[PDB]
Symmetry: C3
Subunit: 398 residues, 3 copies
């Protein structure tokens, strides 16, 4: 009992859900359909629980990375946008929303790391990573630092590593070639070498965690930090005059940051599949649909070109999109979670001086793809196999 | 002990074993060799203990699915029958007895599921699945039911799931590309959807096992049941005037039931190779040779064309063969055992309503890839504590080198 | 040590480290870089500890067989021998020091099983295995056996099993198709069948290890035995007129022993790679270079052509090179560990007569492909989850494998 001639939608309670209900209210006045917008506890964990029984929302708004886990479990139905509508958003986005070579959701917003500098002590930010050794020495004169960011998290260091040539998995025609990890090619090796070199030369530091990093920019002790939109709402509080632009280029090559995409899919057992697709087609994905959601909580850079250009005037949005346009979509696959853990145990050891670059990266590849399925096959089996035998005889033992 | 120079034969019991002694009589005359037949108990597991060591029977009659594991263990010897002899049997029975491109057994009899109907309620049975709902209410008025067959089983339900396009492991070129299941494509979805509908719309029950099915048709409480030749004798004793025909077609596509070709194979450690392949190729696989066994215990439809027509006059056999022709040759690989438990839980979840079609169904592919691996890792685990444990320290090394 | 501006070399306490050291003070004078030659304990284990951290020697001398885990763990650096230098060595040795298509070391010495025969009991040695039966009866009368070698080992039996057409994996350009395990084809069957036939035929015993075969030869109880260069020294002390020649041919085809190649690899962390390459190229590996090492302690067959044709004068050396050119460059991949164990139990079973040739040979490769992931993957995450999450002998893992009922 998901619905019956109405649209109940799910979206995280920190989003522009009030602006969405306004789009649902304008939708109601136009067709005659009651559009409930909800925002329950850890929905992304509770959704695959009820949607498996055939219940819950008609539509669910979430970042694409968590969608592959639904799209595989047959919880999302395939969408069907005509080519006329497919051109309205962006070429790179659609690619973030296909599972098994077929579109599984409508992309809403976008999320990419950008370079945040202090215009007061640094009015013209660097175009490359190569003057940062030059810039830190100059900054050390006034008791300041050129760069200070979280090295304890792979997502933050990945823009540099993947800048020259490195890549997580090889995306081939809407079908990631899983057996093609790229944390070994000279590009990934030269990248991480540079990162550790800055730690060695003392142009940077090692124990910089997110707590320290963000709070080192708000007091104005550093010239630059790399961080995504979620940080903007803290630089305003700190008064600090802040500029946002494209990341610096390494070896002349543009940096590759991982790009998430807030997207909305349609439930597999949601009878109102037409209305759900109807609401999303020309009520939310229209200029206003987003303008209305944007007012409640700004969603950064949007998927829709037409409204993306209207929002482009804002430099921060303008740069986030430019960073996203040369970035790699964070793979929506299940082995992605093992990659992160592998690359994390790499960069921690590489920076610490436990393993020389070339060794820890080549180790990551061996204990990434191989330790990806090892537990997967085992856990996924020992969970379902025991569960199967646990639930079966207990059903008759009730 | 080495199997002996005579042709020693093993065979379960249910089949016409005394019928082989009559074939051994035509064989003891021309070539003059004593053809014994042992009827062992639980031999489907006692074979890789005697034939593994170099003993066991020269020949073994058994369903082809079990022959994969025998074949893979190197216990069975490859055969090469005449190209003209191969055309003596149905081309589809040949693909049943192959491993990695190599023929490893002689096909005897086929066996597929078929529609069984009570002539005194359905004088003309439906060719279409879609008419099951309409026929149910028409019979419910008389206090009856349209169809009733086992649901706690993938063997019986699969025919419908597979009907549209759903398959186990893909067969391409005398092999199985295992990394290519098909319990999730549109076909497999459309099928199980339809089956779950008859359950929720009350045209059909959910908790129906085999016991309730077979009996209800014998008691005349249903007008159709899906079953094989193993229940023919029971409906003979029920005194119920029953028919039998080709399975109902879903979505204009023929329903595909799992096949089961009974076959004989010559084991590797059986030096009496030529005799076996002589006796089997000619003496048993003659027009008359099959009569002999069939006369003891009926074999159902047979792989041999010429003799097939002879029995095909009985519609019961003609439809078993017509349904085998258009079905899945039950793959003889190790991963197949997993396919069962995964669909087993998939179909029971879909029927009880606790999950849904696409939901419980997409799980089966994840369960198929997850169950197969550990089973194909646990049989080495048992071997590591029996070859690197028992062979390394229990026996010889402690029994002589202590 | 980390070095920086110098050259620290690890070899092995028993090889011609002195001869290498003389090349050390030779190179030292020509450039200005003092070369140190050290011989640590169990260095084959020590290297992947200290090298992984950016310490250890600049170059390492070891059998390419273990260089696979070094090249894979990213500890060794890629080399670049010019086209002219490539041709200077025996073509087949270059295949020994390749990883994922890349060269990861310089080959030095070659070591392959040979055929050692007593000249007194048997002047002209048999060139075929099919003659072993008839030769055995001939010697049985005089109270002697024709051949006795190690049977509780696949490194000694394999040469025959593979002689017909079998192999470990598949090398067809510069890679291994690991899903190819060829211990099952007619070759292996016909091979092992012959060997097992000999045991049942009583032409040879079943409970023969190394120590027995080495002793029975040296005492002159047997005519022939299969053994590498390492056993020569003991036959020298036994004063038994021995000769070494090519292995007996089976079914017309040459026999096939696994080839080992001593190699000199350069650490990835070495700041002075240029010196390491210049020392290993233009010094040690030119006639005189090896001439030094060989004099402190013999090397056997050598990767270099010029100095080989001069060493080959010794019949035994030219017979190791003959055997090696027909041998099977032993794979350095991590799967090789399981393969050995697999064949070990396959032969121990076939010899004892428990299972048929066809069974033991099919059951070998299934136990091998299952074993390849049972430990190389299981013990790989087992220790990773143990540490990165945390807060000779297989010793099997957990967890709970509940089946049925
Ligand atoms: Ca349109
Ligand atoms: Ca608000
Ligand atoms: Ca007749
Ligand atoms: Ca077909
Ligand atoms: Ca030292
Ligand atoms: Ca000089
Ligand atoms: Ca040159
Ligand atoms: Zn909420
Ligand atoms: Zn500096
Ligand atoms: Zn407007
Ligand atoms: Zn109905
Ligand atoms: Zn020493
Ligand atoms: Zn003999």
């Amino acid at each position: 009992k998901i619905e019956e001639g109405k649209l109940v939608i799910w979206i995280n309670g920190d989003k522009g859900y009030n602006g969405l209900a306004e789009v649902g209210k304008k939708f109601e006045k136009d067709t005659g359909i009651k559009v409930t917008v909800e925002h329950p506890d850890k929905l992304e964990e509770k959704f695959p629980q009820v949607a498996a029984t055939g219940d819950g929302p008609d539509i669910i708004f979430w970042a694409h990375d968590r969608f592959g886990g639904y799209a595989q479990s047959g919880l999302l139905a395939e969408i069907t946008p005509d080519k006329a509508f497919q051109d309205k958003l962006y070429p790179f986005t659609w690619d973030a929303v296909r599972y098994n070579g077929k579109l599984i959701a409508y992309p809403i917003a976008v999320e990419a790391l950008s370079l945040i500098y202090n215009k007061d002590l640094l009015p013209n930010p660097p175009k490359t990573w190569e003057e940062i050794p030059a810039l830190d020495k100059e900054l050390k004169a006034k008791g300041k630092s050129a760069l200070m960011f979280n090295l304890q998290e792979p997502y933050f260091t990945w823009p540099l590593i993947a800048a020259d040539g490195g890549y997580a998995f090889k995306y081939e025609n809407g079908k990631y070639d899983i057996k093609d990890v790229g944390v070994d090619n000279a590009g990934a090796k030269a990248g991480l070498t540079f990162l550790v070199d800055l730690i060695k030369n003392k142009h940077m530091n090692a124990d910089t965690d997110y707590s320290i990093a963000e709070a080192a920019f708000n007091k104005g002790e550093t010239a630059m930090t790399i961080n995504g939109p979620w940080a903007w709402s803290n630089i305003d509080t700190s008064k600090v005059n802040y500029g946002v632009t494209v990341l610096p280029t390494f070896k002349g090559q543009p940096s590759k940051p991982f790009v998430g995409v807030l997207s909305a899919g349609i439930n597999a057992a949601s009878p109102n599949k037409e209305l759900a697709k109807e609401f999303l087609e020309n009520y939310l994905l229209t200029d206003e649909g987003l303008e209305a959601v944007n007012k409640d909580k700004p969603l950064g850079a949007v998927a829709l070109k037409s409204y993306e250009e209207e929002l482009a005037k804002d430099p921060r949005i303008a740069a986030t999109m430019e960073n996203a346009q040369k970035g790699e979509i964070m793979p929506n696959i299940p082995q992605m979670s093992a990659f992160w853990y592998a690359v994390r145990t790499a960069v921690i050891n590489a920076a610490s001086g436990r393993q020389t670059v070339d060794a820890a990266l080549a180790a990551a590849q061996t204990n990434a793809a191989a330790m990806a399925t090892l537990e997967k096959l085992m856990k996924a089996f020992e969970s379902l196999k025991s569960f199967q035998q646990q639930q079966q005889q207990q059903q008759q033992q009730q």
